[PDB]
Point group: C4
Chain length 355, copies 4
């Protein structure tokens, strides 16, 4: 709610082209298709092949910044991103070689930050997941077995065994309801009453396990990144030790591209920013372009008013941001700083129009 995400967060053309790349698959996969456009997109594989292949050797020129680097992840696919189609091209002379369009699917995941964040936590909590997944397997066959007890007699053809029943378990437990083969008797129909009751508590926990400390990591992700951009601010010599842990949970950083709008004038004042690197376009008769290491919005927050300036991203600014309460929290937290921000609430009145 308090952040300006811009500059094409889904930027890298490596990440982009699997999507157009892999829809190229389908038309090959289909009868009654002319050959015209059939192979026309086979090029587009060759394009994406050649395109990543173009990118490829530039990467293999890894004498760049070659001091200490851990790039087994980033490289893992780039190798295979061209080889797997290639060996596929020949031995699988038949068109099915395109079935090695399973391959680029990691390329989005190549430069997918927030995926390490995902896999980071599973290697702390899977202890639970196992004891639950076991427990999932407990309750599965514990309950799956209860059906073969019954309808083997009059429904062999659907329930003539155990695993045919295990099928109808998790379909029944995991919230799904396919609807292919269903009981006819009473007591077997009774048993479902605990099933959804169970599974929705099972996943009531188990999916909750994920979001539980995932969010801890994500809410932690906004600190590990943001104990940086702290010392850069020239004011933070005075802040006490414990004060920051309160703060950085709320302070998110993002980056705006050049030209874009930051705060348009006259819009309702609802937040303030801490610039740390880049520069701005504070639209005044004399533009007060504050570069790395500044802020604005206090003129509107202390007064509770619209914007005092059409600030626009003159350059690519690594931004921060902040809503009132957390700034009121700061204003509440210390008279030492409200003094200068009060002065600033008068200086920037006289500094906005002036130089």
């Amino acid at each position: 709610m308090s952040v300006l995400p811009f500059l094409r967060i889904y930027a890298p053309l490596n990440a982009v082209l699997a999507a157009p790349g892999l829809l190229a698959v389908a038309a090959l996969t289909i009868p009654d298709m002319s050959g015209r456009s059939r192979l026309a997109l086979a090029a587009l594989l060759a394009v994406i092949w050649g395109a990543y292949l173009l990118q490829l050797a530039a990467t293999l020129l890894k004498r760049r910044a070659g001091v200490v680097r851990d790039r087994t992840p980033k490289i893992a696919i780039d190798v295979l991103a061209v080889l797997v189609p290639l060996a596929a091209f020949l031995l699988d002379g038949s068109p099915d070689w395109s079935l090695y369009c399973a391959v680029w699917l990691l390329k989005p995941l190549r430069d997918s930050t927030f995926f390490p964040v995902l896999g980071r936590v599973l290697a702390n909590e899977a202890r639970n997941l196992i004891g639950v997944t076991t427990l999932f397997g407990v309750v599965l066959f514990a309950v799956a077995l209860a059906a073969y007890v019954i309808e083997r007699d009059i429904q062999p053809e659907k329930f003539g065994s155990i695993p045919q029943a295990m099928w109808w378990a998790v379909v029944t437990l995991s919230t799904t309801g396919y609807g292919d083969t269903i009981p006819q008797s009473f007591a077997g129909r009774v048993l479902a009453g605990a099933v959804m009751m169970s599974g929705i508590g099972i996943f009531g926990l188990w999916a909750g396990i994920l979001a539980t400390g995932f969010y801890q990591e994500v809410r932690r992700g906004d600190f590990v990144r943001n104990w940086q951009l702290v010392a850069a601010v020239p004011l933070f010599q005075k802040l006490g030790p414990a004060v920051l842990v309160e703060i950085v949970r709320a302070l998110r950083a993002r980056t705006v591209p050049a030209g874009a709008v930051i705060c348009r004038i006259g819009e309702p004042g609802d937040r303030m920013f801490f610039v740390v690197e880049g520069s701005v376009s504070v639209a005044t008769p004399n533009p007060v372009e504050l570069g790395p290491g500044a802020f604005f919005g206090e003129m509107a927050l202390i007064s509770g008013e619209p914007r005092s300036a059409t600030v626009s991203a003159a350059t690519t600014v690594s931004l921060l941001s902040l809503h009132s309460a957390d700034f009121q929290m700061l204003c509440s937290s210390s008279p030492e700083i409200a003094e200068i921000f009060r002065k600033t609430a008068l200086e920037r009145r006289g500094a906005a129009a002036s130089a």
Copy 2:
């Protein structure tokens, strides 16, 4: 649990009439329907047309309070709320012009506060949603592909391609279970075991992403609105800086209409209120009508008793409210204020019956 929501929170007749307005659609949509009531409701479009159109020009008289205003949102539909039916009326001479009853559907959303609240946060967290939505597309085709591997042989007519399989993926992943086309082999049936396991963790996160800091915004929504109605209370010169952040998370404000009941006498005392604007009906031999900037309930909370007065909303009172713990928290937080509330617990014993 601690608030009195009254005065028709779904008030504005602009917001109201799409519901009766759009059910007017259906009878046109249906064969074997007489023409009698068919067009009878076509009027009701004309009514709602004329009705908003009546409202319309009053809005276009936007010389009202014309100083600095940002009304592109509120106006966006009012323009189209009449034009789109209108141009539809002529070029679509055929009855299908009523299919521009897709149009009013924003009119509820026109004056839908809590919808900006919704859209506010997506422009902070969609970073995740993308990396997840990509990941959703990863796991989709990653898994969808695994089926065409198999049943293309014996189920062409259902699984004779890739996208027919992508269909059966999210139907299978997204908790649904349609039940149109289902495997017959083993290993393809095996694969589902991870699917629901996955998707319920996927949405185990992804839907959780929404409620995660949505609630932060909503729990923030009760501060940004309620750092107001703070200075109005004549007592709050003494409160310390940090004290309020604890409080305002709990203090919700609402507004009661005139005439309505606030606290009926003899009901079990469970909460107290801070009036800030309006007036009351404190039912005593001399009604102690406390207007803007007062409170009551302490007589019942400190004593832990039923109500001392049938207080009723004499006027439209912008209300606050408060449960005990948070007032006990305050009573715990300072002896400075319990003194006067103790005195008040004796003054209002003598002030209730007296003037």
Copy 3:
């Protein structure tokens, strides 16, 4: 995890008998049923009728404690619990009068505490629910309409209208998957990709709205009840103001019936209790029966050991309970109290066997 719930929490025979009472319905509801047991259970209605009717007039003798009472809720059904069957008995001379076995269903809800707790909060947060429920109706018809656009042509018989499509919306949105009528074209099949994506975020919020501050109320429910049983403890003259808010969130009270086990000897020490009313059976050569206002378990917690006594509920004891951390929190919170609990960890060594 830290509480002993006993004494038949589903106690009241008023609450009990709807369950046996209403299963009495079914056998009447069924063809090919002999008349023998048919009416045999009609008695059981008459029993439950007579039984509550027996209870009834005792309630209508409401001169008991008749000072100030708010009993419209408790009485609302007891009136109807006998009348509705009664008038049903005659005018509905046909057996369908038993269809006024819809009636007792509130009787469990009559003496269902935790149901007021439910309905308490909806009158604070339904503001959201409306803006969401509207939004649910937005996204419903916003999306439902998109289908009649298409398959009216080739699927009139299933999609020959709007509301037939609204049907397939929430079935599709609300996680369900019935599986009666399904598209055949592409673009209409495309649209589902956002649907489950939506609804699982919708209810991703909306159901979350419930558990959100429900839990606040429930976690509040353990304070409003438990600022009581505080002064009774003879030790709590010294505790500081803010200290308790930390505590009472964790301290749950329950009540054990006479005879039952409290802590059996030799079991692993994992918790301690604060008795406030009732008496115990501390199994020692001289039973140290501590009555209202005492505690035990510190001998095992400070030492981290099994139990020092087979304590059993000699009477109906209104119990508290407590795990270590929260007691370590207290031991951490003050040296003033660990002294006496250290002494107690030696006194009760000498007081256990002795008198």
Copy 4:
């Protein structure tokens, strides 16, 4: 996200063999199966029988550490793990005796820690679950009844009774959507609009009840275990009382097996560890093998750098772990300790290469 789970957390071969053990069931369960491998796995039951039976008497030699022990849980199945197959072997002379492969299913649960953790909390919160489960039964028949009102007329064969309707309730309420028998009329089709709306709020709460304070227990599980491994650290004479409660929520302990990697050199520094028991392989010219009661990583965290040593688990080390913020929290929390860790950030520069 901050922990190294290793040494075969799913270790015990007792726990292992039900999985291979119980899949042995299926081939017996199936027609058209040769007898060759049929009984070949009957051995594997005899193996697992004999194998646990081998383990068994070693357990029944419970003179080991025979002072005070509470082993009714661990023993409960080991008794039956061999008897139930055994008596099954004879009286059920027919092959169905293998249906006492329902029996080992507790054997995973035998040595399933985190299962007591599960069952611990249900005996605090089931108060709710009942009032909800009742409420589930309320809303069930409250709503189930509403259908027999209607389609008994034209759908006897599907809705010719009450319980046939109760079937279609929870299938409809519990998020499932089987799709066997569906209405045809309007008002009965209307009713579903509240159903999913309800059940997803029902389980919106009810499943949430589980994860609610489950997580409290789990987040508590990391304290009850970890107030241990506290005094062992020679430094913790100075820490203040309240300081630890902040900490131990974050500090998880796990155990690494011998040989395994702990921190490989040059990897990005992201965490530090507290060793308390075992020994390490700090790969330096003179290996600084710190045994029970030490730490490392500060050299990389204060500097924010890659690893200073390929530390590997020389022995089975009962590990702790810690990320930066929580260490920054400590560094923020006191100058008393950053001094020595600063010194350590120079000592271990000179102590790493040296002895």
